Amino acid sequence: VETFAFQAEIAQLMSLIINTFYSNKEIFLRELISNSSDALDKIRYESLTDPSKLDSGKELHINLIPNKQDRTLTIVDTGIGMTKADLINNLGTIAKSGTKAFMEALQDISMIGQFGVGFYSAYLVAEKVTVITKHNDDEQYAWESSAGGSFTVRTDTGEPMGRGTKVILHLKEDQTEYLEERRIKEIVKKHSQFIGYPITLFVE
Amino acid sequence: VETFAFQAEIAQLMSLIINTFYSNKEIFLRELISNSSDALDKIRYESLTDPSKLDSGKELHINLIPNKQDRTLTIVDTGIGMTKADLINNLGTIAKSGTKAFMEALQDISMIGQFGVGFYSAYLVAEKVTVITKHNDDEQYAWESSAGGSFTVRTDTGEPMGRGTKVILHLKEDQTEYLEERRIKEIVKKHSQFIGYPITLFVE
Ligand SMILES: COc1cccc(C(=O)N[C@H]2C[C@H]3CC[C@@H](C2)N3c2ccc(C(=O)NCc3ccccc3)cn2)c1C
Ligand SMILES: COc1cccc(C(=O)N[C@H]2C[C@H]3CC[C@@H](C2)N3c2ccc(C(=O)NCc3ccccc3)cn2)c1C
């Protein structure tokens, strides 16, 4: 297990998200689904010139998995995945630029999507987020952070996932509405209805 | 005809786009098509709760219309359109916030889309841009700017659009490659292949 410091602007943004009241927190699910959709676009595009890209799994989909016993909501996709370097260095498109100005726009949370840092909206509703991911060119890794200025990266020895990413949201006590079938259906309808991949909401 | 000064940050933005060389100009088309796709999502979503929102036209599509003789490329969509207030005040999502930090990021151009100001990428390839639009709640209007810090708004008397927006790009002398069927097809395939509405090129 390696433990890393967040980029300064990201630590700042995370503190803001966790320690400030925002109303319309449901948009976290729109941002995660948007990210999954983009990751799906990426592998799909690569597959068009190299079909072997899909040897790690042909299905291109998004799954929503509420677990009331564990108090987790999991968003799984079979998109391009992330390498260990992605997990340590962050993705090129997440950087101080998108972050810096958005906080100054805050000081509605929903415009986070616009600035390419939508993932961190997960911290509106989750006390801890685990990102398990597998890219064609790397092994399976687990990234995790409960904020506090650091994240961990470790090999994931667990369930081999083929290719893609799982975001496990360990929900805050007062945010369990996001485990209810009806609430999740409503949010998907309102914000992610026309996403171009199947979104399957698991039943408990 | 009413003439308005741009918001300071937008003037700044446009000048930076126009007066600096950027290689990857083809992303303007991606941006315009992304804006059309979003506009189509918005009317489609309204239509689910009030079918009469489509009295102004049921088809949800994007058309690309090159015109070598006029040296124009027109991008038409049947999305939600914009009102006079939209054309004067700008859209809520385009704001000094998205703008200012993008410029500091600049000083890849492709990152423009991330920050909600993708429309202004048109000035990479166009000396003038005309936006003709019709929203269900308002009359048809023409918005126009050759940059240089001002734009105009007038009631539009031309061909009725029903509902939606036409962006007419009056191309720079050295950017006529974007009127070529081959080039347009290549760009759509590279950057817009999985857009969830039909994109149709009207060949000359
Ligand atoms: C399906 O698509 C997904 C799914 C799940 C997460 C993400 C995503 O946005 N991931 C990134 C943000 C979060 C989540 C995992 C990882 C990469 N991550 C990181 C990684 C590193 C950093 C970081 O701050 N690294 C240190 C650093 C220091 C100085 C400069 C730059 C980075 C921040 N966030 C995406 C795109
Ligand atoms: C299909 O989707 C389309 C198609 C065509 C254009 C657009 C779009 O992004 N339009 C906006 C940006 C461009 C193009 C039309 C209009 C609204 N527009 C404006 C309008 C006003 C302004 C402006 O600066 N107004 C003055 C102002 C001063 C001080 C504060 C705020 C505004 C800038 N851009 C979109 C979203």
Distance CA A72, CA A126 (A): 9
Residues A115/A98, Cβ–Cβ less than 8 Å: yes
Q: Is A107 on the interface with B (CB under 8 A)?
A: no
Nearest to A55 by CA among A41, A43, A42, A39: A43
Q: Which residues of A are annotated as a binding site for ATP?
A: 35, 77, 96, 119
159-188 of A, contacting B, C-beta below 8 A? none
Distance CA A201, CA A185 (A): 8
Please list, in sequence order, all residues whose beta carbon lies within 8 angstroms of the beta carbon of residue B130, skipping any fewer than 6 positions away: B142, B143, B144, B166, B167, B168, B170
Distance CA A16, CA A14 (A): 5
Nearest to A71 by CA among A169, A2, A141, A194: A169
Residue by residue, what is the 3-state secondary structure of chain A? CEEEECCHHHHHHHHHHHHCCCCCCCHHHHHHHHHHHHHHHHHHHHHCCCHHHHCCCCCCCEEEEEECCCCEEEEEECCCCCCHHHHHHCCCCCCHHHHHHHHHHHCCHHHHHHHCCHHHHHHHCEEEEEEEEECCCCCEEEEEECCCCEEEEEECCCCCCCCEEEEEEEECHHHHHHHCHHHHHHHHHHHCCCCCCCEEECCC
- Of the bound ligands, which one is closest to the alpha carbon of residue A2? 1
39-58 of B, contacting A, C-beta below 8 A? 41, 44-45, 48
**Type and span of the H or E element at B141:** strand B141-145
User: What are the helix (H) ranges across B20-160?
Assistant: 27-49, 84-89, 96-106
Distance CA A15, CA B122 (A): 37
Judge if the beta carbon of residue A10 lies within 6 A of ligand 1. yes
Q: What is the CA radius of gyration of chain A?
A: 16
Query: Domain-by-domain residue ranges, chain B?
Result: 1-204
Residues B64/B201, Cβ–Cβ less than 8 Å: yes
Q: What is the CA radius of gyration of chain B?
A: 16
Query: CA A142: distance to chain centroid?
Result: 13
Residues A61/A78, Cβ–Cβ less than 8 Å: yes
Distance CA B5, CA B88 (A): 10
Distance CA A57, CA B140 (A): 49
Residues A144/A156, Cβ–Cβ less than 8 Å: no
Nearest to A154 by CA among A130, A171, A120: A130
Phi then psi dihedrals of residue B12, to 5 deg: -55, -50
Phi then psi dihedrals of residue B148, to 5 deg: 60, 20
Residues B115/A114, Cβ–Cβ less than 8 Å: yes
Phi then psi dihedrals of residue A85, to 5 deg: -60, -45
Torsion A66-A70-A76-A82 (CA) sign: positive
Q: Is B193 on the interface with A (CB under 8 A)?
A: yes
- PDB experimental method: X-ray
**Type and span of the H or E element at B17:** helix B8-19
Distance CA A91, CA A76 (A): 19
**Type and span of the H or E element at B170:** strand B164-171
Please list, in sequence order, all residues whose beta carbon lies within 8 angstroms of the beta carbon of residue A61, skipping any fewer than 6 positions away: A40, A77, A78, A197, A198, A199, A200
Which residue of B80, B82, B120 sits with most ligand 2 atoms within 8 Å of its CB, as the best mutation to test the pocket?
B82
- Write the DSSP symbol of residue B163: S
- Of the bound ligands, which one is closest to the alpha carbon of residue A98? 1
Q: In what order do the strands lie in the sheet with B2-5?
A: B2-5, B150-155, B141-145, B126-134, B164-171, B72-77, B62-67, B199-201
Distance CA A98, CA A100 (A): 6
Strands B72-77 and B164-171: antiparallel
Q: What is the per-residue burial (b if ≥16 Cβ within 10 Å, else e) of B22-31? A: eeebbbbbbb
Calculate how close chain A gets to B2, using CA atoms only, in Å: 30
Q: Going by CA atoms, what residue is nearest to atom 34 of ligand 2?
A: B90
Judge if the beta carbon of residue B142 lies within 6 A of ligand 2. no
List the structure tokens of B117. Answer: 């100001």
Judge if the beta carbon of residue B89 lies within 6 A of ligand 2. yes
- Interface touch A115/B105, C-beta < 8 Å: no
DSSP H helix total and E strand total for chain B: 5, 8
Residues A53/A46, Cβ–Cβ less than 8 Å: yes
- At what resolution in Å was this solved? 1.6
- Write the DSSP symbol of residue B135: -
B162 — alpha (psi -120 to 50), left (phi > 0) or beta?
left
Distance CA A186, CA B12 (A): 41
Q: Which residues of B are annotated as a binding site for ATP?
A: 35, 77, 96, 119
Please list, in sequence order, all residues whose beta carbon lies within 8 angstroms of the beta carbon of residue B51, skipping any fewer than 6 positions away: none
- Type of residue found at A132: I
- Interface touch A97/B101, C-beta < 8 Å: yes
Please list, in sequence order, all residues whose beta carbon lies within 8 angstroms of the beta carbon of residue A23, skipping any fewer than 6 positions away: none
- Interface touch A114/B100, C-beta < 8 Å: no
B148 — alpha (psi -120 to 50), left (phi > 0) or beta?
left
List the structure tokens of B161. Answer: 């659009």
Beta partners for A72?
A67, A170
CA distances from B52 to A120, A150, A191 (A): 38, 52, 21
Please list, in sequence order, all residues whose beta carbon lies within 8 angstroms of the beta carbon of residue B125, skipping any fewer than 6 positions away: B25, B28, B73, B169, B171, B172, B175, B178
User: What are the helix (H) ranges across B62-180?
Assistant: 84-89, 96-106
Distance CA B138, CA B143 (A): 14
Distance CA A40, CA B107 (A): 31
Instruction: Provide, as residue numbers in chain A, all residues whose Cβ is less than 8 Å from the Cβ of B105.
Output: 95, 97-98
Q: Which residues of A are annotated as a binding site?
A: 35, 77, 96, 119
Residue with tokens 């020895």: A157
Nearest to A28 by CA among A178, A128, A154, A196: A178
Instruction: Provide, as residue numbers in chain B, all residues whose Cβ is less than 8 Å from the Cβ of A114.
Output: 93, 98, 114-116
The dihedral over CA atoms of A47, A53, A54, A59, expressed in degrees to the nearest 10, equals -60
CATH architecture of B1-204: 2-Layer Sandwich (3.30)
CA distances from A179 to A54, B1, B36 (A): 31, 54, 34
Strands A199-201 and A62-67: parallel
CA distances from B41 to A53, A66, A191, B97 (A): 30, 27, 10, 24
Count of CB atoms situated within 10 Å of the CB of B172: 17
> DSSP for B180-196?
SHHHHHHHHHHHSTT-S
Nearest to A33 by CA among A191, A151, A146: A191
- Interface touch B115/A115, C-beta < 8 Å: yes
Q: Is B38 on the interface with A (CB under 8 A)?
A: no
Helix (H, G, I), strand (E, B) or coil at B99: helix
Q: Is A150 on the interface with B (CB under 8 A)?
A: no
Q: Going by CA atoms, what residue is nearest to atom 20 of ligand 1?
A: A90
Strands A140-145 and A126-134: antiparallel
- Interface touch A194/B44, C-beta < 8 Å: yes
